[model samples]
Target chain A: AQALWTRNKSEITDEEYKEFYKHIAHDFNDPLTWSHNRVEGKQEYTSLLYIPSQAPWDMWNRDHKHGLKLYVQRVFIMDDAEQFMPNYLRFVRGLIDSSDLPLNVSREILQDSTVTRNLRNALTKRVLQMLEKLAKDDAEKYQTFWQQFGLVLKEGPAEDFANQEAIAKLLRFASTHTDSSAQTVSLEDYVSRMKEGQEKIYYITADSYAAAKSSPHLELLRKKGIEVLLLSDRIDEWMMNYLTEFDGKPFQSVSKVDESLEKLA
Target chain B: MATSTLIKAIDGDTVKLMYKGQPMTFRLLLVDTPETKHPKKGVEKYGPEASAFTKKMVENA
Candidate 1:
């Protein structure tokens, strides 16, 4: 049938983007953000990935119903192909149009194919880059997107070790710098503003914002005006487990009694 | 059911309770919830919901 990838990104109007997104996602609302790109390399593919503005009503269902539509050489192949995206990014909606893959490819062949593997890697990278662009170019919009999907995105570092650095840059946290509940501090931004002589990035996770804010672990850091990222989301504790360090700075949690902080004295 | 009063829902399946008027830790057997307090493996799939459900169950118990 018709292909939405026929036009360049700049050439595609907002109305067309919304229409294409609706057709693919089967939702009434417009996407929170999206990325459309034509990649040419050892493999050539056109992809359109979207971040939905609202979480799916069945987002918490027992069987997660999130995956991308897979297309080969402009012809439809399959829907809800989980291999196209990682589980953490299940909410991402869109399609991958590949020129190299055969139309009659089998599931077994797709599983071990180098082309499929590379396509998955490239698409994951592109999506992370798309999120980074949003976080950098549009703070207000990123904040809204974070509130809707931050917890899900926090699953990245643990899931995709190859892209840990890129995923870390996409992470945001609510620190002492802002008492608000909004998680807005990127690792890069936090490192840039780290206090002189502070060797690690400090954070604490609690059941609530108030609990995290009032954590006794902040006693020394707060006294020294060292900002600590306050994490109250239920996943905060789990997300930090995989995120040990960023940009050569180790992550120090105030909740745990670490004798290492004595050196900071 | 062993009679006890829940002191607090620590996280997910782990909880503090008063067993025979003494404080004790009670981890639900056979049911593993996500780790929110772990130094490692803090969260897993359905972790938030698991914790929330445990808290509600504890409060009602």
Candidate 2:
């Protein structure tokens, strides 16, 4: 029945995945990336999730009916089962089928139960784990993913609490490291090169990359050769509200009248 | 060359052509009965007889 994902990783080959990709995608394009996890615990489910090679239409609309196909007991359940993943990660494709889930599940009951709750959390964790590995192993493909789905992922910290550290690690920012306005800078990179006296991770939040470049906050920081990250997306300010710290260094907003940047200067 | 040969036959009256690279269709000139090969018109009274007469005339000759 569901032999593809639940089977041993060494047993399933790349050609088998390609076949499932054709079936899951409905189009001929290859998947950009995918990972499968078989988790057996108090609740059991195996997830095989994928990201499309190109962005899907209406990907940004959270209200859009987009999610994994759900199959319970090898029987098809729902088409766009959005409950498994957070809306910020809605672009994830494929299925999460469990043997233990009730056959008569409605969206209302699906929301009301503890069984689905734990599975949802684990599914979210698994997707993040997939992203974390992709980020570490492949630069160009991960950058390609960021180009298409970066802004949506920028909302993850605000939406998910347990995975805040993991999501923030994956967040890319346009920093004052270069005069150009590209968001290739990572928090890991930003923290590694922290200025000698800098304790807080500094960022200048603004409406546009142009505004971020010209902000009074960044103007002084750049003169001191201190790299300040630029936040230009709509979700930047709102998302960073939840993401207070990374790597034990708190995120400091340069907008404050007397930032320690003045002290460092 | 205005010559084309039967590549495949559909019915007693309708047959395909081997005119150059394109698959061409040309029908029999004075043909009346079509065949049971159509499945809807089982035998059509002289189905095999008509196609057999056409195949015999044009197959190699």
Candidate 3:
């Protein structure tokens, strides 16, 4: 009854999601948008992806629970095959009604092959496309809405390219000036806060939040009273590789520890 | 409509329970809980509280 992916909108209540939540099982409330994609090919499927406005309370539960619901010829196949989305955008929740898989199995048994990889690749693009539109439609809203999901998006540049720039536009981080853990500083926000004659966007990463904020690396910058964005995610270090510069300012890490006092020179 | 009970917490809004001699994990359509021990997320604010609360609630039941 609720096939919004091939169309638009649904009448199912948050308490009851028939097809919306994979046969009245998962509860996806307040969706950001619904995507209906028809990929015509030999081993193709129809995807009805939904971007939940808010991540699940357990958005970080990575070990299990991932991927879109799998179906073959409209028959329920499995939940979160881990073959549909990347580890970074694991927050993406939806389903793909596939055409090739035989209607014969369950979870822990789905084979990973070209069909899965192709679908994953396509699904990743669709989610990125959704995010780009979300950001462009309402810049202020996307900025405020970022922290909850933005850190995971940081995993994108290295995880996938094509949309590397798309991912960065929606990125946000915590600034030293704020002196808090909340990450609301957009790249544009960092640039606006940049001091006169400053050309580098400074930041640092640690294994933990406390260390990132209380780092000795920022000591020299703090002495100069400059700002550095505090980073602590495990992905933070790797992500910085593709995100060398944005908005015309190169990102500089305080990690060198000793040579950075010359940052002023 | 009736089934077995909750066995373990998968650390999000999802849970793993044995139904018909099969250990099945699924996300509930009823309630939401914070994340727990997720590799990407680790332990987040209020997640511990929610995680502990759900386990005890299910344990008691």
Candidate 4:
């Protein structure tokens, strides 16, 4: 839940925001980012949010919480918006800025109202953008990331078809094609090296990459010098359907094929 | 012979059975009556059981 303190029109000092973060994080550490501003239109409001530099271990537990201070017409109101962030990025800690809420808006009305939905949409997008930046800037670190919270990443595309492309970009894989056998490759990387005249992105699912590479399902593909994305993680088998394509390239499952192709001319 | 515990329980339409002592998990699918025949006295289900038996009958396996 968000904490609100509105006595005067002036903004809260930096120390005040840090104090809030310390209280939330319970570590007395400074926050990475915070949102603070007043909004006005149909419903005037003020809000302040913060993001911790690192997520705590139990952040994903059921007891984990999210929210920032909420104010209506400069009057202190209650705070608590768990739906503000998607389950994938539950670690994200931020608040919203709305400009058209009544001064007497009740928490119940906010929970069931359209205003909260708009805020959730904006919050999810912003958090996704932050994760995208993390993946791009420090790919190595991001690679280490999926080790802990990988399966949840698949929910992006699996749950919402609209953001499938963006979700695909964030997905990481280990392929024999990469320099390091364990290095993570992006769909963008796969698209870049797509074989000439290749229309589909090939992938194989099995107990492990070795098992996939040796899978009878992929024998003919390997014979053709084709590289197949090997997915051994339990989620891969279902997640592929969630993502029908990545950058216009259709994802082909080798197991779905009844037989090997006749040799290319 | 080696053996492992296999569930082959429950929150909902999920089921578990044993495949060579290894627990196999699958979602119980509810299809139209035409899609699924009623549990007959002597006939095994026509879907996965048939497939598994066929797999075990591989030539020279």
Candidate 5:
């Protein structure tokens, strides 16, 4: 059969979306959110992308298979091609059916094809737009989605420089405002509430939220009533290096501010 | 008694200790100190005192 789904149909209902998500993702739980679109440009393609209600059990395992199911001219091409999406978006499950790509293309050919590259770029942008929409339209639902996939999204800046600013807009972190472990504050929110003459966005990453909260580096910010983003994930150290600036405000890590620490004798 | 060479003071209570030819940093157990070396913060009240005390302990050890 032809993958048990159709194209150019009417707007799919929520139930239909859920059923499609189950069929493609092979999971019983409904997706937290999904995006459906028929993109037309240098390449014409239909995409159905879903964010899982919970992260896959093997998400952190690097060797696990990823990438959306790929189709050519509505013909089943392959499963998990790994060329259609960035590695940071491995948790995103979906299908991309393209009219531009040949049906008999090989995996090696797929890697070098211009059409495949364009498809990847368009799909990545669509997924980021869907997430930005979810974050704006619904806070409670977005919080659930973020909890499941924020760390994965944090990997975006390092891997996709072209979309770094858009990716930075989607990142969340725990800060002094909430005093909780939940990473619910966005960089946009931080910039809007930035202190007068504050040129950079302040943050401190630690081994744990508790450790980050009590870090000596934050003492001055706390004293000035300045809210600093607290990042406790281990990958944060690496991620922040790539995520230097967002919306023209550079990210400043409190730990690195102490010139004395660099002057270790 | 466990002895290690002092690499540097991260702050008042945290230091990098060179043990058995390997360098590792540790936060002293049960020691909390004020901020002294933040780029924006030149020095907080009593921050110098804590740094001095930590330096003394490390030098003596």
Candidate 6:
């Protein structure tokens, strides 16, 4: 019957998952929150996404492997699609398999093919949905999620140009104009408060969040009530170089934007 | 696993064995004696034949 371990064919519900998590994860503390999503596009798979109540101290390590494992026909083939999930979204743990995919595929082929692109798009959207769901309810929980993994998100726009706008929506930053000691603001919030004459979404990237927010580049934006996205990651700068605009508005770095801002003059 | 049975140390410690009815063109060197304890050189020395060995193992699995 040991070989018959999986003979249950029994579906484990989300509630059952939590119980299993408690049993296997050996966590005395209860799970903070979770999200489950099913994807059906070029490929079909179900994913249960989670953001733990607290982050592991060593969340970002080159050797620290995290992500979903892929199973084809209920047999484990691979885990942690390093190419499937961007490094920025490395914290996410879930795998995808499809009846649409070929069996015994090589990792190299997977990277160069369109299947990975489709899967990546689906995954990014699913993560965005999960975050949005978290944001929709209980601001405290969303804030906890942000605190744990927000820095990792800044590298998105540079890596994904097609999804730059979507990635921009997930980006959060502390603003100078917003109640000096307030929490980080969403790009949507920045866009909402765009100056009457301003035509671009301006931001600046530096070594640290404080360095970015305090930089003189944001001087004019702060003066004009224009909220600039504080980019603390070097990847953010490279990402902005590739992702030039969001929602018909060009994304201008404070260092790169010309003196054509009549409103600033 | 060793169908040929008798493996000998060739010049330059390169592994020379004819397994599965083919010439051992594998990129491993086998001059160092088994008693000689160097984990890395031993491991890396035995490394290149992995793909060939894996094919046999999977067939026998």
**Candidate 3 local lDDT, A1-265, one digit each (tens):** 4454333223333323223654422763444444556655576577766555556666777466656778887777787765677666766677888776667755533545655656676566666655655555444435544656766676665554444555666677776666567676767677776775566676655566676655454445555666777766666666676566676666655422222324556
Question: Once model 3 is optimally superposed onto the true structure by TM-score, how far is the C-alpha of residue A116 displaced, in angstroms?
Answer: 2.8
- Candidate 1 chain A lowest-lDDT run of ten: A253-262
What is candidate 4's lDDT per residue for A194-255, written digit by digit as tens?
66556766554455565544435343444555556666666655566557777877665543
lDDT of 4 at A91: 55
Which lDDT tens digits does candidate 2 get at residues A1-265?
A: 3567667655654456656866865646555557766666555677787766566665755555467878886677886786777667766778888877898777765555678866776566556555766665455556677767777776666654445776777888888777676578889889877876577676665667886565454545567677877767776666676677788887655532223434567
* Model 3: pairs clashing at backbone N, Cα or C within 3 Å: A57-B34, A57-B35, A58-B35
Indicate the worst ten consecutive residues by lDDT in candidate 6 chain B: B38-47
Model 2 stretches astray by more than 4 angstroms: A1-3, A27-29, A40-44, A62-65, A160-163, A179-181, A213-224, A257-265, B1-61
On DockQ, who's better, 1 or 6?
Answer: 1
List ranges where model 4 is wrong by over 4 Å.
A1-23, A27-55, A66-80, A96-110, A178-183, A206-226, A256-264, B1-61
What are the Cα lDDT values of the candidates?
0.60, 0.61, 0.54, 0.50, 0.61, 0.50
Give one digit per residue, the lDDT tens place, for model 6 in B1-61.
1221111111122212110122211111111123323211111111122344543332211
Per-residue lDDT of model 5, residues A1-265, tens digit only? 2343444434444556667877876777766566666666566777777777777776766565566788887788887675776666666787878888888877776667877876776566656556766675456657877787777776666554555776777788888776678888889889877765567676655668887565554545456667777777766666666566788776554433322223342
Model 1 has a DockQ score of 0.02
Candidate 1 lDDT score relative to the true structure: 0.60
Best by TM-score: 5
lDDT of model 5 at position A58: 65
Off by over 4 Å in 6: A1-45, A53-59, A72-84, A95-125, A178-183, A212-226, A253-265, B1-61
lDDT of 6 at A161: 60
Error of 4 at A33 (Å): 7.8
Give the candidates in order of TM-score, highest first.
5, 2, 1, 3, 6, 4
